[PDB]
Amino acid sequence: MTEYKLVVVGAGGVGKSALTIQLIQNHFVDSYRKQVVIDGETCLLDILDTAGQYMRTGEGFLCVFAINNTKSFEDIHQYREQIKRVKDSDDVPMVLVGNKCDLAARTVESRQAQDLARSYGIPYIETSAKTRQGVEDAFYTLVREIRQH
């Protein structure tokens, strides 16, 4: 089948791993493989969980930040650029993700993340690696985004 290399990046402690492990081992709390079918087509999801050369390899990127951590939100630009850099491209498959949407201590409005997503041209999705909510839309959207290449 077809193979996809997804790279999850983000401010430390935002839930990069929680998400990854939620998709691979279906539960709430590095290399990961996974056979899955998306929109019919069958494919291999190669997920590389990184820390809060190997990025020139990834095909699609998951820029994550927690909605209860303003700085993690302000740091997206930093990673976005570091990516945009090591891949001489102004548009690289990628999705902005606001994790921990299960909390009430929210310091980042959605209206805030959306504006930033539009200025980028990438999709924005909120996920909770705890209630597993959105954990799939996020990853599958990133794939559909890579199929546009």
Residues that bind ligand GNP (CB under 6 A): 12-18, 29, 51-52, 99-100, 102-103, 128-130
> In the chain, what is the greatest distance between 2 CA atoms, to the nearest angstrom?
43
DSSP 118: H
Angle at 43 between CA 38 and CA 101, to 5 degrees: 50
Per-position x/- string for 89-108, each x denoting binding to Mg ion as judged by CB under 5 A, each - no binding:
--------------------
Provide the total of helices (H) and of strands (E) in the chain, helices listed first. Answer: 5, 7
- Residue numbering of the annotated binding site for GTP: 13-18, 29, 51-52, 99-102, 128-130
Q: Which is nearer to ligand GNP, 40 or 104 (CB)?
A: 104
Q: Which is nearer to Mg ion, 30 or 109 (CB)?
A: 30
User: Can you give the length of the chain in residues?
Assistant: 149
